[PDB]
Design a protein around this ligand. Structure first.
Ligand SMILES: CS(=O)(=O)c1ccc(C2NOC([C@@H](CC3CC3)[C@H](N)C(=O)N3CC[C@H](F)C3)N2)c(F)c1
Ligand SMILES: CS(=O)(=O)c1ccc(C2NOC([C@@H](CC3CC3)[C@H](N)C(=O)N3CC[C@H](F)C3)N2)c(F)c1
Ligand SMILES: *[C@@H]1O[C@H](CO)[C@@H](O[C@@H]2O[C@H](CO)[C@@H](O)[C@H](O)[C@H]2NC(C)=O)[C@H](O)[C@H]1NC(C)=O
Ligand SMILES: *[C@@H]1O[C@H](CO)[C@@H](O[C@@H]2O[C@H](CO)[C@@H](O)[C@H](O)[C@H]2NC(C)=O)[C@H](O)[C@H]1NC(C)=O
Ligand SMILES: *[C@@H]1O[C@H](CO)[C@@H](O[C@@H]2O[C@H](CO)[C@@H](O)[C@H](O)[C@H]2NC(C)=O)[C@H](O)[C@H]1NC(C)=O
Ligand SMILES: *[C@@H]1O[C@H](CO)[C@@H](O[C@@H]2O[C@H](CO)[C@@H](O)[C@H](O)[C@H]2NC(C)=O)[C@H](O)[C@H]1NC(C)=O
Ligand SMILES: *[C@@H]1O[C@H](CO)[C@@H](O[C@@H]2O[C@H](CO)[C@@H](O)[C@H](O)[C@H]2NC(C)=O)[C@H](O)[C@H]1NC(C)=O
Ligand SMILES: *[C@@H]1O[C@H](CO)[C@@H](O[C@@H]2O[C@H](CO)[C@@H](O)[C@H](O)[C@H]2NC(C)=O)[C@H](O)[C@H]1NC(C)=O
Ligand SMILES: *[C@@H]1O[C@H](CO)[C@@H](O[C@H]2O[C@H](CO)[C@@H](O)[C@H](O)[C@H]2NC(C)=O)[C@H](O)[C@H]1NC(C)=O
Ligand SMILES: *[C@@H]1O[C@H](CO)[C@@H](O[C@H]2O[C@H](CO)[C@@H](O)[C@H](O)[C@H]2NC(C)=O)[C@H](O)[C@H]1NC(C)=O
Ligand SMILES: *[C@H]1O[C@H](CO)[C@@H](O[C@@H]2O[C@H](CO)[C@@H](O)[C@H](O)[C@H]2NC(C)=O)[C@H](O)[C@H]1NC(C)=O
Ligand SMILES: *[C@@H]1O[C@H](CO)[C@@H](O)[C@H](O)[C@H]1NC(C)=O
Ligand SMILES: *[C@@H]1O[C@H](CO)[C@@H](O)[C@H](O)[C@H]1NC(C)=O
Ligand SMILES: *[C@@H]1O[C@H](CO)[C@@H](O)[C@H](O)[C@H]1NC(C)=O
Ligand SMILES: *[C@@H]1O[C@H](CO)[C@@H](O)[C@H](O)[C@H]1NC(C)=O
Ligand SMILES: *[C@@H]1O[C@H](CO)[C@@H](O)[C@H](O)[C@H]1NC(C)=O
Ligand SMILES: *[C@@H]1O[C@H](CO)[C@@H](O)[C@H](O)[C@H]1NC(C)=O
Lengths: 728, 728
């Protein structure tokens, strides 16, 4: 008997995955949300107390979306009226509650429609962006100091990013950086005056008589990009002068010669800041390190401290130049860069010496630097067992690089191979977060001796429930293509029998530096398909995929829509030759880049696939944004890479779609991959007389994450897959 | 053994109906285009001559879209660079060729991007509109006179109509009216300053990087409407030294009190013009009769010559007040109006007498007045055999109304029951166009003795081809509902066998004053469905339908989405109870108003229909234009008819779609029924978890008629219907 994992189970979230989200507030205390109220926990012993009882804001008159405690614990920022914008941006209202007097501040309050707010790293100073201008409050109940007057809707952005910087450069909306002790406030200013606008309709609720036209500054490939400027203001002088001066720090001459980007800002000390700039042609970046000059009140970046990072085989960085991690005295820093072999490792830099020293090496890569103390550097890599899809925490002794300890590898090797970490303020404690291949496991550890303090959440409740269900299994392995290994994973149906022919669905993404083959545990649509529909769901990381060196990642440089597309087809062949795949029932599907690859694959004329589903796909690179697209494709001009731009479109393969069943889906309010992209695919298919299935989702964006739409799209896709595989 | 009428046959027009479109140029001659040659025919004998060689412009260097010979035969206007706009509007380039001197005028030529152009009714003067302003050319080779200078894109229209006037009032882009002999040129001016704009994306060719946004002044129900003014200018006294003077004729005070419309302009004589005005609440209209005052130079409209036309059960006229047909001296006129019984008949009016006399009467209606002489008035009505879906030509003796003669009834009763007609200049000759139930038949007749001169086109070629294919038959009949009879038609499959059960598709439109049950012969999608798929395609005219009196037509007044929807369900219900219908396979489909009714039906919960297809449907009346919507629904305010505006939406019925298969289709560039309407339907279905099929057509408008799109929609719908009926 035993029920299987059904579509409803996924859509209704019957089997809930538990997690343990904590927020360190010091070197040994963290906050945890247990039953609406906020408790504070002692890391050392595990005892807690009620920090803020849930019944505190009952008669607030508003539903509170999130909170934020000032560094000194004296105040708490309350956020409500949350109105989402793009991937990271949103607007909201805020009130400050005085935790000492247990009162709600009612004077000089933060304006409504505040675009971004942030406490100073120390104390309780506040900085926020409202109407595209920056303001600063030294004290929560005192008036604000205006920092900028140039703010202008869709034109000038001070302290916040425009659309493309938020999405492709900073993975954030804020563009301001408090110095370590809060004295200085740095920030970027974006000018989109000449940036073309993407325009599309938003219908809103039925009650809106006339549709609204959403207009946003968005640079498509080869178009005019926003320009940027960087400034630094001394907040400590605000109460002493009428208008504190924003000292500007200009980009290096090597950047000013053409279009460029401000791509990283990292403070090194109270009076030292590092900036990384990137040329519009993303294979050259410069890092300036600037010191405050107490005599001229100016900021100077000595060329002797400038560092150049370039790439001859591709772009710089996985998605951008990596962040530096400075030693306390700010005289040296560690940074991940690809070595002579093409693998990303940690290099140790002296701020005024151009030659760095690699402290790690091998045919594997460092994923990120997680913490740095005067004695140790902690990082996550995929070195363990040579599995690029695994992740573990490591510790390296700064006084002896030959001393490297893996802190997570052997904790529970069968259940935990994909780790994440969170250190306390001074890295005295760290929470480990295991996400697979077994059920997620959260543990707390002491850094002084790397001893396990205790288990925070083991997901026993769910393990219990899953016992009464025929869950699918997952296989992570590899195939060798041209003396090089390529990893794939398969979500196999329960009681899998290799003596049978199962229908196969290729789950694909395959964009640059992607990884669809890993050791993470997921409860998703593929779970339902394998468990209930007895469908094998596979994923393959071929050329262009990440975390396996530049040889593989830069294979698609300037050539998107080629190798990553072909390898995916070859993967299908390879799978069919494994003998447990029904060659007559092989389907392919993907979202976003996966939608593009799926479409390109369905229109290649390979004959391997019977049907496929593309959700919010890219159809021609000239329609996607500049930062992302140009990174891999360069410029769409005849003197650069225009020919391949025009050669890698979905539309040019419309005719071959007569050989397959296709389902095209897109959200009408997708601000990322514009509906325009599918509108052009559909028109090309209509023009050559090809029938296909389509579905638009009114007012949904790139994620189609709305509760109702989410249930609707997966239901619709399920019927299509079952029909194509005629289950029925 | 005899093929059937296939989908390809319909889509490739393999079976073409022959026509015979002629143009009367005098009381005894007409122009007919043959082999691209313009021939002139003598109506009395049938002899012809070549009027213009198909090779005359053999090296014109432009594709000629259309041509237009001046009334005096001296010149010919050549139209090229045609670019379509809405239903009737478009811009083009023109050149004038001198027929007498066989030369192409090259001096003072009409501008490119001209919006409208027309010859004076007599002679060869010209009036064209360019950049929203009116120009007049007394001679083809002479400079033109600027009449208006207020022209402004999307704001002020002179001589041309705005979006709503073009579509809902004049069924023409043109807004200028030449006096009978060309002395005066009357014109209307529209002001859309405060009219909101409908905005939508147009994607264009793949090469366009950024979608363009189209915006057109379009007043939705309740919104601010455009205002109108009327002017008359003397084209005989124009000066190259002074700006033309236009005399304004203001609307009556009973109209100026509130919002209103100019709905008809008709010249009575060389110096008398009639105008009809309609209040925004379309149940009260006023006709003004204005005479030119030679001494004053002004136009006066005596209040004593004012005629009011109102309605207590509904709006005025079928879609607007009918046009008057003045006698030679202009002292009296005939006009179709609804009588005390609610049936539309011809009433004889004296210009200075309030009461008019009806000259026809009966439980049938006059469709239109076609020609008037001192002895006879010719008209088309559905009186014959009491069939409201039949049309015949009649003449009534103006000196003895008891003497009524049908001129088309008995010509060929089996083959011809639906005629339209074309009279020559003085009604000396008329062409009859029979369009059903048999193949179209065109004939020429002489009025003096109503003789049948000859057959112009009998479609004997098509008849010879059609006998080689198993064509379906059409049954026109009626059912009774509450002592009232309602007509329906059924397209029955070849070799119809009433002992068998056939699936049934209800083809519906059902908008106010519509007629889907008639005797017209058609080669369409239904032909293929019955001939090849053996599906019965039925249509029904319930409450709200036209040509049967106001008791029926006005039944849905201020109540759209009620009785016309309910009656369709009743009809299907009754057809389902017939021996030859498979009550398990009953479908419904419609386009435009038919899309709305199909949707309202599917969301009714009647359980009668298994599936349905809605193309470019209206979903809520507040989204449609003011002129058409308010005509039937009044204003959407709480004081007027808001409750019913809110109760008649498709969206409120979403939940009821759970038990039916629904395919929703709409073109993204529909300027008439905005994509918005379908976008809200899909969102409501998604919001209640109901699955359905959808298809958008990039850049297609309300007609979805581009060649490839047309083939694609009918192909996609064919698969859907066959699948719903389990048909191979
Ligand atoms: C885990 S996965 O499914 O393999 C996966 C999924 C998604 C990405 C990925 N790559 O670029 C993005 C993301 C920026 C990134 C957030 C910082 C990018 N901007 C994006 O959304 N698109 C849309 C079209 C094209 F695919 C790029 N997201 C990725 F690298 C890997
Ligand atoms: C011959 S039929 O299929 O019954 C038929 C088809 C179409 C009409 C009809 N009614 O109003 C229009 C047309 C007026 C202009 C005269 C052309 C109107 N504006 C329209 O396109 N819509 C869209 C939504 C709503 F249904 C009305 N067309 C009609 F009265 C009858
Ligand atoms: C966790 O429990 C410990 C032990 O009871 C608390 O320790 C406080 O430690 C300080 C420093 O020595 C003493 O002054 C206090 O007397 C101790 N607590 C008390 C009430 O006496 C600690 O406060 C607890 N932490 C939390 C978050 O509950
Ligand atoms: C944003 O950049 C634009 C340039 O595109 C700047 O606009 C120029 O400003 C100068 C001086 O005011 C004028 O002479 C030019 O006419 C402007 N050009 C344009 C496009 O109009 C603008 O000043 C910048 N804004 C800020 C705050 O730096
Ligand atoms: C604060 O100082 C800044 C820096 O000068 C002022 O910004 C200048 O304002 C003037 C006049 O408004 C403009 O001509 C300049 O273009 C502005 N410069 C910049 C950097 O934008 C700002 O107006 C001052 N505010 C107050 C209240 O004095
Ligand atoms: C935060 O760092 C700033 C920058 O060094 C400190 O301000 C300097 O303080 C020294 C005294 O130690 C003075 O000589 C300088 O004039 C100050 N410079 C500036 C720009 O203010 C500041 O004292 C530090 N804050 C704290 C709380 O330690
Ligand atoms: C069209 O009709 C107008 C108006 O009746 C004619 O113009 C009148 O002609 C008479 C005879 O010459 C003059 O006495 C009047 O003063 C004219 N009135 C106006 C308003 O112009 C005109 O002749 C006719 N045009 C044609 C071509 O027959
Ligand atoms: C034209 O129709 C309107 C609207 O139906 C009539 O005006 C009034 O409409 C309201 C509802 O909107 C009713 O309560 C009134 O009874 C209607 N009559 C009056 C006098 O207000 C109007 O009567 C109609 N005109 C004609 C000639 O029938
Ligand atoms: C049709 O035929 C008649 C003669 O049968 C043609 O002739 C008439 O017009 C000619 C010039 O227009 C004259 O030369 C004839 O005298 C005159 N004959 C009669 C009886 O009126 C007439 O033009 C022909 N029409 C066409 C269009 O070809
Ligand atoms: C077209 O209509 C507009 C608006 O009704 C007319 O303009 C006016 O409305 C303005 C408010 O937007 C008032 O401020 C103006 O006083 C009023 N009149 C003028 C001349 O501005 C406009 O005149 C109309 N245009 C024409 C050519 O008739
Ligand atoms: C309308 O456009 C046409 C085409 O551009 C103009 O005709 C000429 O076209 C030739 C080439 O086709 C050009 O060299 C000329 O510049 C155009 N103009 C002339 C006078 O030769 C035409 O003139 C335009 N007319 C108007 C009123 O816009
Ligand atoms: C906090 O609130 C939750 C839900 O409102 C409740 O279950 C819990 O008992 C509350 N605890 C306290 C201390 O108020
Ligand atoms: C924010 O909006 C609320 C809602 O009207 C208003 O009452 C409040 O005063 C506003 N606060 C500020 C700082 O503007
Ligand atoms: C950067 O890439 C461009 C495009 O291939 C190339 O022309 C240039 O030489 C590269 N620069 C470096 C430093 O590799
Ligand atoms: C005129 O051209 C057409 C083709 O456009 C041709 O069929 C016809 O023969 C020509 N006319 C004559 C009289 O030859
Ligand atoms: C005609 O009127 C327009 C509109 O004001 C004006 O600009 C033009 O100069 C006038 N021309 C003559 C000849 O009066
Ligand atoms: C008569 O029939 C109509 C439908 O044809 C129905 O709506 C009405 O209620 C019935 N009774 C009366 C009195 O009209």
């Amino acid at each position: 008997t035993r029920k299987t994992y059904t579509l409803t189970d996924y859509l209704k979230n019957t089997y809930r995955l538990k997690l343990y989200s904590l927020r360190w507030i010091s070197d040994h205390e963290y906050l945890y949300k247990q039953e609406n109220n906020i408790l504070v926990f002692n890391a050392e012993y595990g005892n807690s107390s009620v920090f803020l009882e849930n019944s505190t804001f009952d008669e607030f008159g508003h539903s509170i979306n999130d909170y934020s405690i000032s560094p000194d614990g004296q105040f708490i920022l309350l956020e409500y009226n949350y109105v989402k914008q793009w991937r990271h941006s949103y607007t909201a209202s805020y009130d400050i509650y005085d935790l000492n007097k247990r009162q709600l501040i009612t004077e000089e309050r933060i304006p409504n429609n505040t675009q971004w707010v942030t406490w100073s790293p120390v104390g309780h100073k506040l900085a926020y962006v409202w109407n595209n201008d920056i303001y600063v409050k030294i004290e929560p109940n005192l008036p604000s100091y205006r920092i900028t007057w140039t703010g202008k809707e869709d034109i000038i952005y001070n302290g916040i990013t425009d659309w493309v910087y938020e999405e492709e450069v900073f993975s954030a909306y804020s563009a301001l950086w408090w110095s370590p002790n809060g004295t200085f406030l740095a920030y970027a200013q974006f000018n989109d005056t000449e940036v073309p606008l993407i325009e599309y309709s938003f219908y809103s609720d039925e009650s809106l008589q006339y549709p609204k036209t959403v207009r946003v500054p968005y640079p498509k490939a080869g178009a005019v990009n926003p320009t940027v400027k960087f400034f630094v203001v001394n907040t400590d002088s605000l109460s002493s002068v009428t208008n504190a001066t924003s000292i500007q720090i200009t980009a290096p001459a090597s950047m000013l010669i053409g279009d460029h980007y401000l791509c990283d800002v990292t403070w090194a000390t109270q009076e030292r800041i590092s900036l990384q700039w990137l040329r519009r042609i993303q294979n050259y970046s410069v890092m300036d390190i600037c010191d405050y000059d107490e005599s001229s009140g100016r900021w100077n970046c000595l060329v002797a401290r400038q560092h150049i990072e370039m790439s001859t085989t591709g772009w710089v960085g996985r998605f951008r130049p990596s962040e530096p991690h400075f030693t306390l005295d700010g005289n040296s820093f560690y940074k991940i860069i690809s070595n002579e072999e093409g693998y990303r490792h940690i290099c140790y830099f002296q701020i005024d010496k151009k030659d760095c020293t690699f402290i790690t090496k091998g045919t594997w890569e460092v994923i990120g630097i997680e913490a740095l103390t005067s004695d140790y550097l902690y990082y996550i890599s995929n070195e363990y067992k040579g599995m690029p899809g695994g992740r573990n925490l490591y510790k390296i002794q700064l006084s002896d690089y030959t001393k490297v300890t893996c802190l997570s590898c052997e904790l529970n090797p069968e259940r935990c191979q994909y780790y994440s970490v969170s250190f306390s303020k001074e890295a005295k404690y760290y929470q480990l977060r295991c996400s697979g291949p077994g059920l997620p496991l959260y543990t707390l550890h002491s850094s002084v001796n790397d001893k396990g303090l205790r288990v925070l959440e083991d997901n026993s409740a769910l393990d219990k429930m899953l016992q009464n269900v025929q869950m699918p299994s997952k296989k992570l392995d590899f195939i060798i293509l041209n003396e090089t290994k390529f990893w794939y994973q398969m979500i196999l149906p329960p009681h899998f029998d290799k003596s049978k022919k199962y229908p196969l669905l290729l789950d694909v993404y395959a964009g640059p530096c992607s990884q669809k083959a890993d050791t993470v545990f997921r409860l998703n649509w593929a779970t339902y398909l394998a468990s209930t529909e007895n469908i094998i769901v596979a994923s393959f990381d071929g050329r262009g995929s990440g975390y396996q060196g530049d040889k593989i990642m830069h294979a698609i440089n300037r050539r998107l829509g080629t190798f990553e597309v072909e390898d995916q087809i070859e993967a299908a062949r390879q799978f069919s030759k494994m003998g447990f795949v029904d060659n007559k029932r092989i389907a392919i599907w993907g979202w976003s880049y996966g939608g593009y690859v799926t479409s390109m694959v369905l229109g290649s004329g390979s004959g391997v696939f019977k049907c496929g589903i593309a959700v919010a796909p890219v159809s021609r690179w000239e329609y996607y944004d500049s930062v992302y697209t140009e990174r891999y494709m360069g410029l769409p001009t005849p003197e650069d890479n225009l020919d391949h731009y025009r050669n890698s479109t979905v539309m040019s393969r419309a005719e071959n779609f007569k050989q397959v069943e296709y389902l095209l889906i897109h959200g009408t309010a997708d601000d990322n991959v514009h509906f325009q992209q599918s509108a052009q695919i559909s028109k090309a298919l209509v023009d050559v007389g090809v029938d296909f299935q389509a579905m638009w989702y009114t007012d949904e964006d790139h994620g189609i994450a709305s509760s109702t739409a989410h249930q609707h799209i997966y239901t619709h896709m399920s019927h299509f897959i079952k029909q194509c595989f005629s289950l029925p």
